[PDB]
PDB file of C-alpha atoms in Angstrom:
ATOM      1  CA  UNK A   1      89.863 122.565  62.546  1.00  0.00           C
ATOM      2  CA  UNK A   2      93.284 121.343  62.344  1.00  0.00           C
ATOM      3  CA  UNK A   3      93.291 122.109  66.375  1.00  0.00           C
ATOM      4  CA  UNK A   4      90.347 119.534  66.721  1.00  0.00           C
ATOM      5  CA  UNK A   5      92.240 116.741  64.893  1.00  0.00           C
ATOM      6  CA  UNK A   6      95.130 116.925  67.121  1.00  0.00           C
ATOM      7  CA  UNK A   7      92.925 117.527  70.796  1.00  0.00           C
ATOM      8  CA  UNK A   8      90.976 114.535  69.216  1.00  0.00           C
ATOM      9  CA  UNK A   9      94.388 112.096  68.631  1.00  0.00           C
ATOM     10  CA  UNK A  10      95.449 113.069  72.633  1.00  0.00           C
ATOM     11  CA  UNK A  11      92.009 112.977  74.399  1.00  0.00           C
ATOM     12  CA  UNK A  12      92.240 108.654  72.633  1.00  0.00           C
ATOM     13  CA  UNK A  13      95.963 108.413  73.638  1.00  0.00           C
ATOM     14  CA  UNK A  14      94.685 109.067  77.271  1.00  0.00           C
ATOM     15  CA  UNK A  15      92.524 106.814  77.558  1.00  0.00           C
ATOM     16  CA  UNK A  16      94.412 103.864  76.253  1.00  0.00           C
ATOM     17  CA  UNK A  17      97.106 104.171  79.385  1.00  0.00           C
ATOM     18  CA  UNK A  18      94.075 104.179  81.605  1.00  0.00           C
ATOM     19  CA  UNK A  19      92.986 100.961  80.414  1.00  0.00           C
ATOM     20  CA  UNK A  20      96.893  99.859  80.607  1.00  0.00           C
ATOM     21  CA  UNK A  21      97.427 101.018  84.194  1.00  0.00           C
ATOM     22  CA  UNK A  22      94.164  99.634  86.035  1.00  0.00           C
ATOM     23  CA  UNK A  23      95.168  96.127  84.914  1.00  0.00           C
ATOM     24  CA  UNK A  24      98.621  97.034  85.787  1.00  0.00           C
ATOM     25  CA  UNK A  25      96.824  97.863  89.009  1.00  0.00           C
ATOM     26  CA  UNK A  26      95.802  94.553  89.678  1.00  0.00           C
ATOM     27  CA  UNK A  27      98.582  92.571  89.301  1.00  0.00           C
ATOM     28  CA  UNK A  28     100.424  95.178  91.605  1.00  0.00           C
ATOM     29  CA  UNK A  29      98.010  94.578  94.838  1.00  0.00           C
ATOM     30  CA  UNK A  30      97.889  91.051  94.482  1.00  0.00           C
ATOM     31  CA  UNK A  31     101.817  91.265  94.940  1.00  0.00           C
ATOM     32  CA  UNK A  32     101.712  94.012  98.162  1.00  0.00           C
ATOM     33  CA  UNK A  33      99.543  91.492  99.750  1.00  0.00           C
ATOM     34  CA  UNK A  34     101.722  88.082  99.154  1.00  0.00           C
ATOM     35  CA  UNK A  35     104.932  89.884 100.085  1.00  0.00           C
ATOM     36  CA  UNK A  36     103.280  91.131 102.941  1.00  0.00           C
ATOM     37  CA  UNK A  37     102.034  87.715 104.444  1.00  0.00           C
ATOM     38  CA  UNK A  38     105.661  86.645 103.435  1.00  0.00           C
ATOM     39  CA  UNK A  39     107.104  89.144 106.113  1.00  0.00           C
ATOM     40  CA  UNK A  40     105.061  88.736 108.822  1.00  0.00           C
ATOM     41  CA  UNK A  41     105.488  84.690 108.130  1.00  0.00           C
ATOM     42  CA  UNK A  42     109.763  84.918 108.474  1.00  0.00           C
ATOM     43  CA  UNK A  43     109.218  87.408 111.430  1.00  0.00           C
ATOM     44  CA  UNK A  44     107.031  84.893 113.714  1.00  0.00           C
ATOM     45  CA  UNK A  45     110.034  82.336 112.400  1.00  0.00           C
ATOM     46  CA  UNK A  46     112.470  84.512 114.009  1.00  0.00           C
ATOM     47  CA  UNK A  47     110.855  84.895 117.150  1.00  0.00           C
ATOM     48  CA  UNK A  48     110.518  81.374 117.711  1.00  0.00           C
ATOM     49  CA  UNK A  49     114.064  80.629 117.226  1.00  0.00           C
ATOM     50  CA  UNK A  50     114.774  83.672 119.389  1.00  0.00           C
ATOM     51  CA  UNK A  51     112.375  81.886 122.266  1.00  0.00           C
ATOM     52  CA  UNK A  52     114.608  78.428 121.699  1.00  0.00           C
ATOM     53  CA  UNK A  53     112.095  76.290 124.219  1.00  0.00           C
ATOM     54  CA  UNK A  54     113.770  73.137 123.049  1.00  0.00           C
ATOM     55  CA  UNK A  55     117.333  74.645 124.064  1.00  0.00           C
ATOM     56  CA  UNK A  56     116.189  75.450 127.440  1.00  0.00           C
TER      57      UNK A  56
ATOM     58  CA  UNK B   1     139.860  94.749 122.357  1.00  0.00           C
ATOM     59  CA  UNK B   2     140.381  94.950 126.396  1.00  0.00           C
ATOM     60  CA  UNK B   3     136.820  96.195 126.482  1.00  0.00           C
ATOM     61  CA  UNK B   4     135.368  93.021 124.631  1.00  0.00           C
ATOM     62  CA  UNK B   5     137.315  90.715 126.936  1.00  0.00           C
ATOM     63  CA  UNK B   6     135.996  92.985 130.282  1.00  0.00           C
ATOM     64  CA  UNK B   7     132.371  92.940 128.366  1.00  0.00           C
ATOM     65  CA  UNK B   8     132.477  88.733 127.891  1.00  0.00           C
ATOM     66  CA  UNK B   9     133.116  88.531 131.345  1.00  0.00           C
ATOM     67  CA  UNK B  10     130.598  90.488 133.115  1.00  0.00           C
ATOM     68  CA  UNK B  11     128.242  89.334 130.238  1.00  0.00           C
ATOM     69  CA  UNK B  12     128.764  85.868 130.983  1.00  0.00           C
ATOM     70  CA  UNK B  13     128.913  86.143 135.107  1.00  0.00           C
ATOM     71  CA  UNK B  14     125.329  87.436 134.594  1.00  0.00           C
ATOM     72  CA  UNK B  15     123.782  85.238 132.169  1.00  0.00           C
ATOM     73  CA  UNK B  16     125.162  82.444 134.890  1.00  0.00           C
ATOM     74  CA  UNK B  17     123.272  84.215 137.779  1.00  0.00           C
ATOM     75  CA  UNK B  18     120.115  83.896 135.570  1.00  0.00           C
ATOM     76  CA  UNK B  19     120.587  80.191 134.917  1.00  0.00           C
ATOM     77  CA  UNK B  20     120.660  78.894 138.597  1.00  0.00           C
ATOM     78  CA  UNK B  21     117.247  80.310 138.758  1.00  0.00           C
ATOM     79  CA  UNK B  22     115.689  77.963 136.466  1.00  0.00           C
ATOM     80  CA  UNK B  23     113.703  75.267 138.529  1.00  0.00           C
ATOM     81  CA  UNK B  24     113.806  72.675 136.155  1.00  0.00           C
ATOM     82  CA  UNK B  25     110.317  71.210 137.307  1.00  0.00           C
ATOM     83  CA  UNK B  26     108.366  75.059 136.943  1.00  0.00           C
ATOM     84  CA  UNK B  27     110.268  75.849 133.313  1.00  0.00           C
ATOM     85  CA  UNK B  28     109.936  72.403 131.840  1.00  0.00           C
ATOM     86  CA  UNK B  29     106.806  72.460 131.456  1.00  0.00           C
ATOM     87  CA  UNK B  30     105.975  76.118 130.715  1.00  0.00           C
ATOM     88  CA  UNK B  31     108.960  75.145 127.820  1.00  0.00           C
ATOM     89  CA  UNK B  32     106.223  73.291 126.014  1.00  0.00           C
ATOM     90  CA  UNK B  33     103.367  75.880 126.382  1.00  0.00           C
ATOM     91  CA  UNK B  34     105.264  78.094 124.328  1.00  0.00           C
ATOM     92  CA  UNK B  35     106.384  76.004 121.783  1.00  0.00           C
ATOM     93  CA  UNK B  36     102.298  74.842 121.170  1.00  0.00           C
ATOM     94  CA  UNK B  37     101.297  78.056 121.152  1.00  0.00           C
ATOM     95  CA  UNK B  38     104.004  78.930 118.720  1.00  0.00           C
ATOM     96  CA  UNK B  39     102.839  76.586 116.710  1.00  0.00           C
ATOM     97  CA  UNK B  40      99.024  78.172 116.623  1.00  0.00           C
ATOM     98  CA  UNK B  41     100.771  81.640 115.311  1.00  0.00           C
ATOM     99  CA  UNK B  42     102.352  79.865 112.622  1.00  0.00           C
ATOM    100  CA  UNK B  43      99.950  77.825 111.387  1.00  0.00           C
ATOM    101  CA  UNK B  44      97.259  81.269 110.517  1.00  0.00           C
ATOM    102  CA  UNK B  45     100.304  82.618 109.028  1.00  0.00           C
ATOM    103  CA  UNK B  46     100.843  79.765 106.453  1.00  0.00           C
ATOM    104  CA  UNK B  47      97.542  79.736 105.832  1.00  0.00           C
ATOM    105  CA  UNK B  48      97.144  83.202 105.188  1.00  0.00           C
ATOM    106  CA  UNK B  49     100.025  82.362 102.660  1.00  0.00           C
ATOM    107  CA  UNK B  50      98.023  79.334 100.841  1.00  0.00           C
ATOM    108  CA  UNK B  51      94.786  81.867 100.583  1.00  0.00           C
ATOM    109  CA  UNK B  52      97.381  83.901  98.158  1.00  0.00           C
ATOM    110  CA  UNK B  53      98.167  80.822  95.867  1.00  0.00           C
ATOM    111  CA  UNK B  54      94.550  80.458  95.071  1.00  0.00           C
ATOM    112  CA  UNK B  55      93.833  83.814  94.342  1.00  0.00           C
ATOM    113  CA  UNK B  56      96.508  84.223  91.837  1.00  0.00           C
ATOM    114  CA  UNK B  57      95.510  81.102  89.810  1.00  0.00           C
ATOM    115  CA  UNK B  58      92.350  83.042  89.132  1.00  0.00           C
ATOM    116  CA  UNK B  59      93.714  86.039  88.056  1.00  0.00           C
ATOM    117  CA  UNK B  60      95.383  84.352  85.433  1.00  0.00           C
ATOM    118  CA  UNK B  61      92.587  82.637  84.328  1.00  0.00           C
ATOM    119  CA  UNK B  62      90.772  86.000  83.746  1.00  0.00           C
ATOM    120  CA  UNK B  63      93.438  87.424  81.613  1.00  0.00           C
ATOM    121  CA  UNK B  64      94.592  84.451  79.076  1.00  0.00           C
ATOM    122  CA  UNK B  65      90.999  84.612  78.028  1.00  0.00           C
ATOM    123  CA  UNK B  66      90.238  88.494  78.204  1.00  0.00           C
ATOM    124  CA  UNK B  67      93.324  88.594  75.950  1.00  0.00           C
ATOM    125  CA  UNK B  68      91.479  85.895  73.523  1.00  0.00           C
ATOM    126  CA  UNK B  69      88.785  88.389  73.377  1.00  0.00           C
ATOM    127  CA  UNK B  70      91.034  91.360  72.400  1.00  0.00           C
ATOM    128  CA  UNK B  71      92.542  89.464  69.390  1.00  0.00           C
ATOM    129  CA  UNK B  72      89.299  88.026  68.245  1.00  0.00           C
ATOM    130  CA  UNK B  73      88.455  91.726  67.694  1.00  0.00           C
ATOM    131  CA  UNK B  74      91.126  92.306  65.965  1.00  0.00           C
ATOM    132  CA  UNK B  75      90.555  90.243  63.100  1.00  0.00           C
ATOM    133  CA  UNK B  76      87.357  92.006  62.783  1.00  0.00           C
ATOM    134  CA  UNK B  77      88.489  94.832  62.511  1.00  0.00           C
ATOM    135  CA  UNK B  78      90.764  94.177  59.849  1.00  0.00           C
ATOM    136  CA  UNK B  79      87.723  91.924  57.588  1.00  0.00           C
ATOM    137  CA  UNK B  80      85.849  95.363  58.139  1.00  0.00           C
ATOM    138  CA  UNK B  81      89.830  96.994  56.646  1.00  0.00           C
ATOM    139  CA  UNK B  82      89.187  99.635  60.325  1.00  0.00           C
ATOM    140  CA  UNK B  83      93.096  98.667  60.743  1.00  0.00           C
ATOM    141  CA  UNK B  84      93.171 102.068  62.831  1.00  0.00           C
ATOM    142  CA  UNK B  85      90.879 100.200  65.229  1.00  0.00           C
ATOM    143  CA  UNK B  86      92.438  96.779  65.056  1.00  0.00           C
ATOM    144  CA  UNK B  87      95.897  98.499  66.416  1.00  0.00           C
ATOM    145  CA  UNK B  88      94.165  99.897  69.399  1.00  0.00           C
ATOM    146  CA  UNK B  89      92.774  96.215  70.299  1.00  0.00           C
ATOM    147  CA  UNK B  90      96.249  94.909  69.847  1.00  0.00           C
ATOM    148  CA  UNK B  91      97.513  97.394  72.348  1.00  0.00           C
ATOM    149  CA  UNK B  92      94.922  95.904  74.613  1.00  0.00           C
ATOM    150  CA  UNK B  93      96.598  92.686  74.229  1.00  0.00           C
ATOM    151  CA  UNK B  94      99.897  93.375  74.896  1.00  0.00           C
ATOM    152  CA  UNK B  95      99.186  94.860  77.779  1.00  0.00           C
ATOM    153  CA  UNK B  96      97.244  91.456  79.108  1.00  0.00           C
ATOM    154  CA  UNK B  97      99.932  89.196  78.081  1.00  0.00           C
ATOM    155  CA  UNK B  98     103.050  90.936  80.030  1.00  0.00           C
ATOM    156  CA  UNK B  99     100.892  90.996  83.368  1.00  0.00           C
ATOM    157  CA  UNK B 100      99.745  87.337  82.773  1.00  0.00           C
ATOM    158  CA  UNK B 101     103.394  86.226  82.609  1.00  0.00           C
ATOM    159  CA  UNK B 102     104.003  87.765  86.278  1.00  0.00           C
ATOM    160  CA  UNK B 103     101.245  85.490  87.487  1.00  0.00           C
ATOM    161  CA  UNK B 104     103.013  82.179  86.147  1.00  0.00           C
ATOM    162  CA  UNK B 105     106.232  83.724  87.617  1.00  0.00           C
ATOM    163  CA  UNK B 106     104.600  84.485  91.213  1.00  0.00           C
ATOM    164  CA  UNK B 107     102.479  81.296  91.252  1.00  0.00           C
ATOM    165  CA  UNK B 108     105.348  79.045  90.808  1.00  0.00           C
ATOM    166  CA  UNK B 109     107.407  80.953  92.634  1.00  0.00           C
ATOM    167  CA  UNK B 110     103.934  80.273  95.652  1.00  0.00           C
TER     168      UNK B 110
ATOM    169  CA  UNK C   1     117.435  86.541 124.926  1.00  0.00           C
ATOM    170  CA  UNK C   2     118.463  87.165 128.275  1.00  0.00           C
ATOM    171  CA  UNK C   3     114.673  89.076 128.799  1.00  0.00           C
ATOM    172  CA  UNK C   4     113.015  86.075 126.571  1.00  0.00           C
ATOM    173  CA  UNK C   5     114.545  83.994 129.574  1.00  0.00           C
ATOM    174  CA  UNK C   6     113.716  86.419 132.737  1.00  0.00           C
ATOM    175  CA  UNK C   7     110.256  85.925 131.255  1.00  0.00           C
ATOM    176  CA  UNK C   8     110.079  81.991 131.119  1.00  0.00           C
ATOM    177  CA  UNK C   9     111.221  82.054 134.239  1.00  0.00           C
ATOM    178  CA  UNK C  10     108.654  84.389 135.618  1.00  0.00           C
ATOM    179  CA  UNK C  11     105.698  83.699 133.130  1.00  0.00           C
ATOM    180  CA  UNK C  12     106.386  79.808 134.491  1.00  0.00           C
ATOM    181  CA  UNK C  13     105.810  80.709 138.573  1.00  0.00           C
ATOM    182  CA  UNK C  14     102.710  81.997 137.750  1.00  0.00           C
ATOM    183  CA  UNK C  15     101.139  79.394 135.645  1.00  0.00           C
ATOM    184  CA  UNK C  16     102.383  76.935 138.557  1.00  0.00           C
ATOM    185  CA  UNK C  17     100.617  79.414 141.132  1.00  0.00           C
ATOM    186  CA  UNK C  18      97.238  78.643 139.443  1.00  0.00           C
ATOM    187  CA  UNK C  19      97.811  74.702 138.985  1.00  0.00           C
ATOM    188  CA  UNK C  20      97.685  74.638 143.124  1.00  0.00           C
ATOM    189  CA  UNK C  21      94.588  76.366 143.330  1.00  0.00           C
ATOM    190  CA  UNK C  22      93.122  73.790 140.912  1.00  0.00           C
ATOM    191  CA  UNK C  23      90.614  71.379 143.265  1.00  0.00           C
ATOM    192  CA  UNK C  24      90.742  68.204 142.052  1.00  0.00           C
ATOM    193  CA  UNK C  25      87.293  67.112 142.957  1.00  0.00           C
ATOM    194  CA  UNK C  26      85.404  70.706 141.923  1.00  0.00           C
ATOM    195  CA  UNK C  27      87.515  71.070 138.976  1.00  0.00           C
ATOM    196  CA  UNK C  28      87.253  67.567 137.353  1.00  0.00           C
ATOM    197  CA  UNK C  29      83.905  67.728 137.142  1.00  0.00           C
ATOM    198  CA  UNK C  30      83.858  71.325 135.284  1.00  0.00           C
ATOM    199  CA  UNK C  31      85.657  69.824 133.010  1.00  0.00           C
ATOM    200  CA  UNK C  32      83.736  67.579 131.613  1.00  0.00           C
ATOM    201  CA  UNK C  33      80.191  70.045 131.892  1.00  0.00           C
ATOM    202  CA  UNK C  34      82.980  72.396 129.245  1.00  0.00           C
ATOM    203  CA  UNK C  35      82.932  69.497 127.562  1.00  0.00           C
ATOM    204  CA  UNK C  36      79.714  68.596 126.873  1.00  0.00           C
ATOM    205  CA  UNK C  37      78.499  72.166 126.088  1.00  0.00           C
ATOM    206  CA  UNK C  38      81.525  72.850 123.426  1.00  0.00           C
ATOM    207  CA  UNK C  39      79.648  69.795 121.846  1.00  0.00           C
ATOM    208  CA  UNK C  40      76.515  71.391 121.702  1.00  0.00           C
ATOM    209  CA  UNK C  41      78.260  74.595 120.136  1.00  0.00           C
ATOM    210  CA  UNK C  42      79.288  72.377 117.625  1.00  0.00           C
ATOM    211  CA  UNK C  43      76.408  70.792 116.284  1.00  0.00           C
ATOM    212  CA  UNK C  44      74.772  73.773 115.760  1.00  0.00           C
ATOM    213  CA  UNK C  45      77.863  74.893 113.474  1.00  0.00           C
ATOM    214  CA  UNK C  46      77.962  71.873 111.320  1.00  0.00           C
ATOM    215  CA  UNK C  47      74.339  71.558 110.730  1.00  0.00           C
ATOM    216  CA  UNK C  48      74.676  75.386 109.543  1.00  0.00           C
ATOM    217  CA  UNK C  49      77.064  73.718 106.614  1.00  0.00           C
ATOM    218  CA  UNK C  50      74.801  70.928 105.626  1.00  0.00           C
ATOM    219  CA  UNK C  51      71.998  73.177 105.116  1.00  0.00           C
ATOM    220  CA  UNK C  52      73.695  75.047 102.293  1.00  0.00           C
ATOM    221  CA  UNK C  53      75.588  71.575 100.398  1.00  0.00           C
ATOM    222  CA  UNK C  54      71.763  70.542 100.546  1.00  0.00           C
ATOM    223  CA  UNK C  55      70.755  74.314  98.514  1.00  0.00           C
TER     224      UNK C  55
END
């Protein structure tokens, strides 16, 4: 019984940085997907420039 | 270095022997189909951009008032003295108010 | 690019190749029956919108 007490202070600890890292979680896709539109944004950029129609 | 000077020159001799192939009246025109259909590419990505900046103006609208919710529980807690329970709902909080500050950050960044 | 302008060059004898085998008098009138069924397409799409601002 003083086994218990401490199994019974971890098994709550463990659930609390659950609850921290799933919204953690969120926030973290929601900036993989704007950084990722970002790039493929400043790559067609580059391409066009690279093309330079209005040069030729 | 020599080897520049020998590279600028046959570099240049060719990219001469390209330009005297150009008919102007063939590549004038094919000039502006690219740059309208370069202009159809863009646009979906810039849109796919704006579809971003609305999205994260609803996340943090979920998590200023989830966090309300948290600290409303708190002060239960402590009227019913369970201050072991009104720490864990605080840790809740904190949690909720450091991600919600990335949003603002992001979204004016947007 | 020295291939970016190999490929103008070539991408824009084709596209010239086609706009002699264009008909003026078979084509022109094509045209216009594109026309008139791309409206009918349409319609059908917007009345699909009203439907549901009406629900």
């Amino acid at each position: 019984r003083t086994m218990s007490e401490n199994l019974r202070r971890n098994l709550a600890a463990l659930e609390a940085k659950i609850s921290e890292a799933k919204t953690k979680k969120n926030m973290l896709q929601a900036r993989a997907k704007a950084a990722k539109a970002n790039a493929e944004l400043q790559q067609t950029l580059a391409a066009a420039a690279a093309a330079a129609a209005a040069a030729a | 270095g020599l080897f520049d000077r020998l590279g600028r020159v046959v570099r240049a001799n060719l990219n001469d022997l390209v330009s005297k192939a150009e008919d102007p009246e063939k590549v004038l025109e094919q000039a502006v189909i690219d740059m309208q259909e370069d202009l159809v590419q863009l646009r979906q990505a810039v849109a796919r951009t704006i579809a971003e900046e609305k999205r994260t103006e609803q996340r943090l609208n979920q998590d200023t008032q989830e966090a309300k919710k948290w600290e409303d529980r708190a002060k239960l807690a402590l009227t019913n003295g369970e201050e072991n329970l009104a720490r864990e709902a605080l840790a809740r909080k904190k949690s909720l108010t450091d991600t919600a500050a990335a949003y603002q950050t992001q979204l004016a960044q947007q």
